[PDB]
Amino acid sequence: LPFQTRSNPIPWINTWLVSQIDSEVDTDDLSNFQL
Amino acid sequence: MNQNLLVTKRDGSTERINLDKIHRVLDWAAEGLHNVSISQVELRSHIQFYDGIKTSDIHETIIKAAADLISRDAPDYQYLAARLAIFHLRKKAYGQFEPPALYDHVVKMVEMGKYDNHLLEDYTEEEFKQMDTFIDHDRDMTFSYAAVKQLEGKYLVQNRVTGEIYESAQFLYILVAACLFSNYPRETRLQYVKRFYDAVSTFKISLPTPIMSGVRTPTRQFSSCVLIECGDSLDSINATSSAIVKYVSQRAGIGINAGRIRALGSPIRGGEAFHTGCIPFYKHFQTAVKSCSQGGVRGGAATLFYPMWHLEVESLLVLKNNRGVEGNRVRHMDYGVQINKLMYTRLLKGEDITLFSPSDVPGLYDAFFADQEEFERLYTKYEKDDSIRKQRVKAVELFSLMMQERASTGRIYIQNVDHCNTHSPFDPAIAPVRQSNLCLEIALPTKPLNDVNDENGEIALCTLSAFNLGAINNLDELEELAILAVRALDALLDYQDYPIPAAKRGAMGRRTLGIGVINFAYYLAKHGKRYSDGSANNLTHKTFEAIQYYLLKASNELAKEQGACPWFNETTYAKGILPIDTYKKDLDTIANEPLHYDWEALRESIKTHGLRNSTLSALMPSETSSQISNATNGIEPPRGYVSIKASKDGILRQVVPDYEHLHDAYELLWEMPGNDGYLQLVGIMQKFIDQSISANTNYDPSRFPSGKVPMQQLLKDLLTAYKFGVKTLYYQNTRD
Amino acid sequence: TRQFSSCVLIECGDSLDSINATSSAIVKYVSQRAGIGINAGRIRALGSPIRGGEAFHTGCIPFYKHFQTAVKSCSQGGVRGGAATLFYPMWHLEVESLLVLKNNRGVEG
Ligand SMILES: Cc1cn([C@H]2C[C@H](O)[C@@H](COP(=O)(O)OP(=O)(O)OP(=O)(O)O)O2)c(=O)[nH]c1=O
Ligand SMILES: Cc1cn([C@H]2C[C@H](O)[C@@H](COP(=O)(O)OP(=O)(O)OP(=O)(O)O)O2)c(=O)[nH]c1=O
Ligand SMILES: Cc1cn([C@H]2C[C@H](O)[C@@H](COP(=O)(O)OP(=O)(O)OP(=O)(O)O)O2)c(=O)[nH]c1=O
Ligand SMILES: Nc1nc2c(ncn2[C@@H]2O[C@H](COP(=O)(O)OP(=O)(O)O)[C@@H](O)[C@H]2O)c(=O)[nH]1
Ligand SMILES: Nc1ncnc2c1ncn2[C@H]1C[C@H](O)[C@@H](COP(=O)(O)OP(=O)(O)O)O1
Ligand SMILES: [Mg+2]
Numbered sequence: 012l013p014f015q016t017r018s019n020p021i022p023w024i025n026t027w028l029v030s031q032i033d034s035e036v037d038t039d040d041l042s043n044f045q046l
Numbered sequence: 047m048n049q050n051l052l053v054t055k056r057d058g059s060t061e062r063i064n065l066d067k068i069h070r071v072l073d074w075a076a077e078g079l080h081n082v083s084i085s086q087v088e089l090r091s092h093i094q095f096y097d098g099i100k101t102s103d104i105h106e107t108i109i110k111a112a113a114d115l116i117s118r119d120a121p122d123y124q125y126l127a128a129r130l131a132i133f134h135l136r137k138k139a140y141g142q143f144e145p146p147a148l149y150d151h152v153v154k155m156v157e158m159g160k161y162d163n164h165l166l167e168d169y170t171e172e173e174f175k176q177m178d179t180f181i182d183h184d185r186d187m188t189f190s191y192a193a194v195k196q197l198e199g200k201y202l203v204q205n206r207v208t209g210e211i212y213e214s215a216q217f218l219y220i221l222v223a224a225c226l227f228s229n230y231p232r233e234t235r236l237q238y239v240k241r242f243y244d245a246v247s248t249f250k251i252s253l254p255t256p257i258m259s260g261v262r263t264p265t266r267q268f269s270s271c272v273l274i275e276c277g278d279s280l281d282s283i284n285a286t287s288s289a290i291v292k293y294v295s296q297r298a299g300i301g302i303n304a305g306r307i308r309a310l311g312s313p314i315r316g317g318e319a320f321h322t323g324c325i326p327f328y329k330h331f332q333t334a335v336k337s338c339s340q341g342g343v344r345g346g347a348a349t350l351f352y353p354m355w356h357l358e359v360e361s362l363l364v365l366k367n368n369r370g371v372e373g374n375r376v377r378h379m380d381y382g383v384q385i386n387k388l389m390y391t392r393l394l395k396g397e398d399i400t401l402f403s404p405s406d407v408p409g410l411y412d413a414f415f416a417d418q419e420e421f422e423r424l425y426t427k428y429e430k431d432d433s434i435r436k437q438r439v440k441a442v443e444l445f446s447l448m449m450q451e452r453a454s455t456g457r458i459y460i461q462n463v464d465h466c467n468t469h470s471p472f473d474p475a476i477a478p479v480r481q482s483n484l485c486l487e488i489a490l491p492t493k494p495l496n497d498v499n500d501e502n503g504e505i506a507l508c509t510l511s512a513f514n515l516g517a518i519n520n521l522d523e524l525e526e527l528a529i530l531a532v533r534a535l536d537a538l539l540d541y542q543d544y545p546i547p548a549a550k551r552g553a554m555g556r557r558t559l560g561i562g563v564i565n566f567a568y569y570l571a572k573h574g575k576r577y578s579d580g581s582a583n584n585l586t587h588k589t590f591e592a593i594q595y596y597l598l599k600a601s602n603e604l605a606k607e608q609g610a611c612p613w614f615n616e617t618t619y620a621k622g623i624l625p626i627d628t629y630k631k632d633l634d635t636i637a638n639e640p641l642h643y644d645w646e647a648l649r650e651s652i653k654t655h656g657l658r659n660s661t662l663s664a665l666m667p668s669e670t671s672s673q674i675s676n677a678t679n680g681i682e683p684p685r686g687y688v689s690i691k692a693s694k695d696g697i698l699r700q701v702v703p704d705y706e707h708l709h710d711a712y713e714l715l716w717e718m719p720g721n722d723g724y725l726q727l728v729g730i731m732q733k734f735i736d737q738s739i740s741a742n743t744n745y746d747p748s749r750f751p752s753g754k755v756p757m758q759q760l761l762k763d764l765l766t767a768y769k770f771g772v773k774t775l776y777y778q779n780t781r782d
Numbered sequence: 783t784r785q786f787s788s789c790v791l792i793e794c795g796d797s798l799d800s801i802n803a804t805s806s807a808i809v810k811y812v813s814q815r816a817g818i819g820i821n822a823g824r825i826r827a828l829g830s831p832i833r834g835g836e837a838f839h840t841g842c843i844p845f846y847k848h849f850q851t852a853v854k855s856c857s858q859g860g861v862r863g864g865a866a867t868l869f870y871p872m873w874h875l876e877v878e879s880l881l882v883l884k885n886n887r888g889v890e891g
């Protein structure tokens with residue numbers, strides 16, 4: 012490579028060079044819980 | 047067929063259009079950046095040349111063009127568009143790039159009435175030229191595009207009718223430092239003015255919107271949060287309304303407590319009139335909030351609070367829902383529902399909840415906050431009294447109604463009032479916490495007013511600031527940073543004015559501060575931790591212990607210097623009780639990190655010398671102010687590597703700090719399986735935070751069967767938050 | 783409760799102190815059987831500078847909305863509801879926006 016590494020200065024050129032809520036609750040499951 | 051078109055320069059003159067001027071400006075801004083393209087910016091500008099085109103319209107277009115190229119593949123555009131915008135703001139205010147001398151600028155601005163008159167009285171020309179050497183105008187080259195647009199849109203001193211920008215970014219910083227320490231003795235004044243300038247201009251300390259936009263201007267009001275309590279009388283409602291109008295007009299955001307207002311149908315004056323209800327008064331509060339502040343930096347916003355057991359609670363929960371008629375809708379305010387342990391217990395047991403009007407249950411309202419035992423006594427007794435007007439609802443249905451309106455609107459908030467008082471810096475008997483603020487991070491005592499200037503009422507003010515967790519390299523750096531932040535805010539309380547006498551009463555009596563954190567998500571990425579898995583639990587405990595310790599130590603040393611705050615005896619600190627004592631003991635099951643700082647020596651030191659400030663720490667969302675340091679706002683995880691945030695001009699693209707190196711360490715908002723990991727971190731933080739935390743809960747409907755979010759999980763998360771002592775719940779974000 | 787004057791006339795000055803005083807006076811007298819007349823012609827027009835230019839004046843309408851919620855705030859349960867008439871000069875700058883404030887079309891703002 013003769014030149015420094017560089018990102019594509021014209022990236023636009025590549026375009027041309029290729030083709031609700033589940034309302035159910037379970038109160039028994041909620042009591043199985045310590046505040 | 048060359049037409050030879052003309053462009054209009056900034057000074058009105060015209061010359062031949064010369065594209066090399068545009069080339070040079072863009073080449074200047076893209077210098078040192080990676081993966082940017084001058085050509086891309088020019089072609090994507092689609093700039094339409096007409097004879098006589100303003101040169102400012104040309105530049106403002108290429109700013110928008112480079113701003114829209116901010117992407118994951120080309121993140122350095124955040125700096126290209128920022129340099130173009132900083133360059134634009136220099137010309138708008140100075141006519142050139144190089145800013146004038148610090149003294150020359152202050153002289154011109156005070157003459158135009160844009161700066162406060164006192165700056166020239168408290169500082170000499172020799173001191174002004176000496177602060178000019180502190181200024182590093184090249185620090186304007188460290189903002190991102192989102193940061194600069196917030197400066198241009200909100201913070202820099204400007205004309206809201208003309209659009210004329212008056213100052214630079216480094217002038218804002220140096221003058222906020224100058225004004226705050228302007229009352230310090232001259233032997234240490236400029237030492238602080240330099241130190242505080244460096245702290246905020248290198249993004250060690252974050253300053254709120256009213257401080258950034260206000261501290262140097264004639265109008266002195268810089269507390270972000272204003273808490274007003276309303277009593278059950280026309281005199282109190284009138285005073286509350288008048289206080290709101292005053293504080294929306296001066297940069298503030300209100301939390302209103304209208305839970306004391308008696309329910310619809312209650313007798314007025316023995317029975318001479320039918321009580322029209324809460325809604326006609328909430329509507330009066332809404333027009334007060336939106337009355338005048340839409341022309342300033344930001345519009346007025348307020349959150350109104352009421353207990354869950356209020357008789358109208360079913361009518362109040364639906365006030366934001368967009369359906370229904372206007373008579374029973376108050377959409378343009380937010381709401382916080384107040385809940386305690388007894389209310390949650392009725393839900394777990396599947397029992398009922400009895401609804402009362404606060405006027406028909408003597409002593410129940412005050413007990414609802416201060417005395418949890420007295421509440422269960424009075425509540426269960428009043429449930430059996432049949433002469434008292436009541437209405438029973440299934441606790442399951444009432445909780446379902448609240449969470450349904452919380453999920454759809456996202457702005458129905460929760461405040462666990464028992465946690466707000468069992469783990470608070472205040473003695474519930476003397477100064478209970480009965481409400482919160484706009485963003486649910488403030489918890490301060492309040493007492494309603496009988497007139498606009500009622501001396502016996504208390505309006506709670508809170509002044510804010512934040513520590514950039516991404517800018518510190520060692521937790522002990524917080525020691526020096528806490529000293530600088532606390533001193534600047536405590537001096538701000540004596541420096542500013544107060545439009546409502548009752549508000550000055552609380553601010554001078556308690557000197558309540560609310561210092562939080564920003565860049566917490568970026569902080570976890572640097573430590574290779576995540577929100578959801580719980581790998582940040584011990585780190586959060588160690589981090590926020592140091593935050594609270596160095597904040598208390600800073601305010602304790604300041605108490606030795608200038609005396610503790612007048613009403614310090616009303617604090618639990620005065621009794622020798624520390625947050626490390628009153629935190630919820632369930633936190634010991636999600637964090638085994640030991641305390642690493644000498645809290646017992648501070649406890650003795652606080653017993654002896656007190657605290658200059660009644661409160662110190664509060665984790666605010668910092669939606670706007672955190673963008674200045676391009677930080678991830680508050681404790682929230684970023685929505686994406688490039689996040690879209692709102693602004694006056696339009697949408698802003700904000701890149702996460704250190705994206706190229708840490709994009710894998712980040713856990714994005716919707717990359718989280720659930721809320722349990724986040725809510726635990728909020729609980730661990732709350733162990734040390736004086737007030738509260740603007741904690742969000744987030745839900746992705748696609749992560750659930752049938753694409754709908756279950757009410758079961760909304761409640762399980764709400765209960766999980768209470769189990770770990772979370773005081774309040776802010777936004778509920780629902781994806782798409 | 784001794785209040786028996788049917789008509790109450792309140793004049794509003796171009797200040798937040800006056801607007802606050804006006805609103806509080808409205809609330810008191812609507813609650814005591816009275817019917818209000820409000821003079822808000824002195825309020826400066828939309829877009830005028832506030833405090834030299836520190837703020838953009840939101841206009842009369844955001845304040846007129848505040849006057850309305852005061853009138854309907856509390857007297858609907860009593861003998862009769864609260865009602866008020868607001869006055870402005872024909873040459874006011876917002877006069878084209880004020881004439882249509884009762885028309886049932888347009889948005890709520
Ligand atoms: C601030 C700065 C700008 N620049 C670049 C950006 C600008 O294109 C240029 C300074 O802009 P100007 O001095 O305004 O030059 P101009 O090309 O617009 O010509 P004039 O206004 O006289 O008609 O130099 C630097 O090279 N170094 C710097 O430090
Ligand atoms: C007088 C009055 C009060 N109210 C409401 C506002 C307050 O929430 C509540 C109390 O008003 P107050 O101003 O306390 O009324 P009062 O002291 O004359 O009567 P009371 O003995 O009932 O306290 O009643 C009305 O809605 N309409 C009215 O006309
Ligand atoms: C301060 C302020 C005033 N206003 C409006 C309400 C009044 O109709 C009008 C006058 O307010 P005033 O209360 O007269 O404000 P001021 O005396 O501080 O400012 P000025 O010197 O401009 O009079 O401005 C707002 O809409 N929002 C605000 O924040
Ligand atoms: N008037 C008003 N106040 C706000 C708004 N957003 C936030 N605040 C106030 O600022 C405090 C903290 O908000 P924060 O997210 O830190 O906003 P910032 O500091 O302005 O970036 C809140 O408690 C509010 O009182 C707003 O949109 N309008
Ligand atoms: N003769 C010219 N023709 C077209 N664009 C020009 C121009 N001179 C300057 N510009 C562009 C380049 C910059 O992006 C933008 C702002 O330039 P500036 O240096 O701030 O303004 P000015 O040179 O008019 O004082 O205008
Ligand atoms: Mg130029």
Ligand SMILES: [Mg+2]
Pocket residue numbers: 278279
């Ligand atoms: Mg009364």
Ligand SMILES: [Mg+2]
Pocket residue numbers: 796797
């Ligand atoms: Mg005035």
